[PDB]
Amino acid sequence: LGKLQDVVNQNAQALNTLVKQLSSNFGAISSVLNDILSRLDPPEAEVQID
Amino acid sequence: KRISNCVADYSVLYNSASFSTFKCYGVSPTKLNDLCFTNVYADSFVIRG
């Protein structure tokens, strides 16, 4: 079946892309904010979290 | 010089005041301790003011 399969595959792949979006640096020096929080002082940390 | 396989101890590093510059880059001196690094290096040279 074609019509019943795309409506599930597109949603699953969009959810996979949403999950993968957390693995990107987004122009920063790290992906997870906890590394900056445990490594940087709060004035420099808040810029990376922003 | 390469330093490894030991308890890093910087309490005497920040509790002293004989140094003139103690601004760290990227890592912060407040969060410098309690962080487990794989290897730590130390270079040394004499330069002008």
Could you write a compact summary of the structure shown?
The structure is cut from a larger assembly and holds 2 copies of chain A. The first copy, chain A, is mostly helical and 50 residues long.
Keywords, please?
part of a larger assembly; 2 chains; 50 residues; mainly alpha; 66% helix; 0% strand; viral protein/immune system
Notes on the structure:
The structure is cut from a larger assembly and holds 2 copies of chain A. In chain A, helix 2 runs antiparallel to helix 3. With 50 residues, chain A is mainly alpha-helical. Chain A has helices at residues 3-20, 33-39, 42-49. Chain A is rod-shaped. The first copy, chain A, has 3 helices and no strands. The A-B interface holds A 38-41, 44 and B 26-28, 30-31, 35.
What proportion of the residues of chain A form beta strands (DSSP E)? under 5%
| Structural class based on helices, strands and sheet pairing of chain A | mainly alpha
Q: Radius of gyration of chain A, rounded?
A: 17 Å
Q: What's the end-to-end separation of chain A, in Å?
A: 45 Å
Total strands of chain A? 0
Count of alpha and pi helical runs of chain A: 3
Greatest chain-chain contact? A-B, 5 and 6 residues
Sheet bearing the most strands of chain A, described?
none
Portion of residues in helices of chain A? 55-70%
In quaternary terms, these chains amount to part of a larger assembly
Shape of chain A: rod-shaped
SSE order of chain A: HHH
